[PDB]
Amino acid sequence: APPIMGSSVYITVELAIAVLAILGNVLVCWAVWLNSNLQNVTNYFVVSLAAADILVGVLAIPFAITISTGFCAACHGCLFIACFVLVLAQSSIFSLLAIAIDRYIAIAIPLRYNGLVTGTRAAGIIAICWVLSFAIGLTPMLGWNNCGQPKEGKAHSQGCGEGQVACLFEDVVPMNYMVYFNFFACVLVPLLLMLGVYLRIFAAARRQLADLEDNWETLNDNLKVIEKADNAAQVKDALTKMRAAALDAQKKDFRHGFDILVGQIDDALKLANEGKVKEAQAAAEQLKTTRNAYIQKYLERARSTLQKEVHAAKSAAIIAGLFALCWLPLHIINCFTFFCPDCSHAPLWLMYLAIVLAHTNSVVNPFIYAYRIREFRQTFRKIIRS
Ligand SMILES: CC(C)CCC[C@@H](C)[C@H]1CC[C@H]2[C@@H]3CC=C4C[C@@H](O)CC[C@]4(C)[C@H]3CC[C@]12C
Ligand SMILES: CC(C)CCC[C@@H](C)[C@H]1CC[C@H]2[C@@H]3CC=C4C[C@@H](O)CC[C@]4(C)[C@H]3CC[C@]12C
Ligand SMILES: CC(C)CCC[C@@H](C)[C@H]1CC[C@H]2[C@@H]3CC=C4C[C@@H](O)CC[C@]4(C)[C@H]3CC[C@]12C
Ligand SMILES: CCCCCCCC/C=C\CCCCCCCC(=O)O
Ligand SMILES: Cn1c(=O)c2[nH]cnc2n(C)c1=O
Ligand code: NA
């Protein structure tokens, strides 16, 4: 069977993916430039991520096509075109890990969030990750490669000149690097961390969501036992437990509503200490209007804000998920090639299928923002319409 015919499909799909990679991610970068609301610390890691996806369609995919030919080239030159995609992958992981941490700081200590993360501190972080990504990605070029024991039969078959080799991935890149160093240390380890990071995010949101409900119940259940109370001692316990939850739930309309709430508990409390039973019961009745004029609104404003931060977390969680699903197949085939020599090698069409599946990750990113993030959605429309 002709080799080029099967190759014709692969090249066509690769070019198609490149087109969607460049266009889709350019729209993200253009969106952040225009809109001011999209200019924040979280989106800066998004643009860094989009930068990696753009560079896939421009270089990594052209590089992926050129490798498949098995053309003649210097072994060191062959290493760059084979390993450059590893730089772009390592950059994305650091970007995904940063977003997870940025979302964790935003939900854990929202007070300290303004002081811990800033605009400039993020730029320095991104630079370090890009520098580290080049080091990690292009590690084989420092000496950990198969240039020392080349395939001379393939070199003479291909008609390669002296010093040149038939440039193929599995020929120049050792599998111990791809499995132990790249897959396990650099990919799998940070991915497991993102799992644990997002787990602590949802768990933290779960606690705050019975906190705001425990205090609400603490307020109501202590109110109705003042009405049917027996003595001054009963009114004390119910009000002192309410006063505890009053300050607890607090952690200018905000501070003003509570000054009236706690102020009314203080007044009703002092009537209990004086022994005024019926006047203490009646004073605590004024809390009901107070409750449903300020508090109940802060119950559905604070609760509303929690759903925003959780929806933002899930939206980010999907990206890291889709990244894992796209890349993992290719890593497993590397694990089979490495760990099982008794097994047959994976067919060439399956190799092609895994590569394009890894490349597709570059396309899926902008579709998630538009479908999930409302600000990105409305931003895209006015750009397309103009
Ligand atoms: C700024 C962007 C657009 C430019 C991209 C640079 C690319 C096209 C250049 C930079 C260095 C180049 C490599 C340098 C050396 C060799 C060895 C030679 O035997 C085959 C080509 C090969 C492997 C080159 C391939 C193309 C290459 C990777
Ligand atoms: C999703 C994350 C947790 C990783 C998935 C687990 C990976 C590392 C596991 C799942 C199945 C495993 C393979 C199952 C079968 C074989 C054939 C055997 O002769 C050698 C080991 C080898 C080649 C295993 C290598 C590692 C492997 C690919
Ligand atoms: C991560 C999720 C989506 C799982 C994806 C499935 C991948 C990782 C699995 C499913 C079945 C697997 C294949 C089963 C059998 C063989 C034959 C062996 O001679 C080479 C590897 C090869 C070809 C395996 C490669 C990896 C493989 C394609
Ligand atoms: C779509 C955006 C990418 C822009 C570049 C498009 C062209 C690059 C794709 C393929 C050509 C690259 C080289 C192909 C194999 C070289 C042949 C050889 O030297 O034997
Ligand atoms: C990342 N990667 C691999 O892990 C791999 N294994 C075999 N070809 C491969 N190619 C072309 C590749 O890009
Ligand atoms: Na990417």
Numbering used by the authors: 0 to 208, 1001 to 1042, 1059 to 1106, 219 to 305
Please, what does the article write about this entry?
To validate the versatility of the VIALS workflow, we used two different IMPs, archaerhodopsin-3 (AR3) and the human adenosine A2A receptor (hA2AR), as proof of concept. AR3, from the archaebacterium Halorubrum sodomense, is a light-driven proton pump that undergoes a sequence of conformational changes induced by the absorption of a photon and is commonly used in optogenetic experiments. hA2AR is a class A G-protein-coupled receptor that is expressed in the cardiovascular, respiratory, immune and central nervous systems, and is implicated in immunosuppression and the regulation of sleep. However, the production of integral membrane protein microcrystals in lipidic cubic phase at the desired crystal density and quantity is challenging. This paper introduces VIALS (versatile approach to high-density microcrystals in lipidic cubic phase for serial crystallography), a simple, fast and efficient method for preparing hundreds of microlitres of high-density microcrystals suitable for serial X-ray diffraction experiments at both synchrotron and free-electron laser sources. Using the VIALS approach, room-temperature structures are reported of (i) the archaerhodopsin-3 protein in its dark-adapted state and 110 ns photocycle intermediate, determined to 2.2 and 1.7 Å, respectively, and (ii) the human A2A adenosine receptor in complex with two different ligands determined to a resolution of 3.5 Å.
We also report crystal structures of human hA2AR in complex with two different ligands determined by SSX. To demonstrate the applicability of our VIALS method to structure-based drug design, we performed ligand-soaking experiments. Glass vials containing the hA2AR microcrystals were divided into two groups (the same number as the number of ligands) and the crystallization buffer was exchanged (using a gas-tight Hamilton syringe with a long needle) [Fig. 1(b)] with new mother liquor, supplemented either with 0.5 mM theophylline, a weak non-selective hA2AR antagonist, or 1 mM LUAA47070, a known hA2AR antagonist. The crystals within the glass vials were left to incubate at 20°C for 3 to 6 h, to allow ligand exchange and binding, prior to SSX data collection at DLS on the I24 beamline. A total of 10 457 and 3618 frames were successfully indexed in the space group C2221 for the hA2AR in complex with theophylline and LUAA47070, respectively. The final refined structures of hA2AR in complex with theophylline and LUAA47070 were refined to 3.45 and 3.50 Å resolution with an R work/R free of 21.85/24.12 and 21.20/25.40, respectively. Despite the resolution, our hA2AR SSX structures in complex with theophylline and LUAA47070 were well resolved with good-quality electron-density maps.
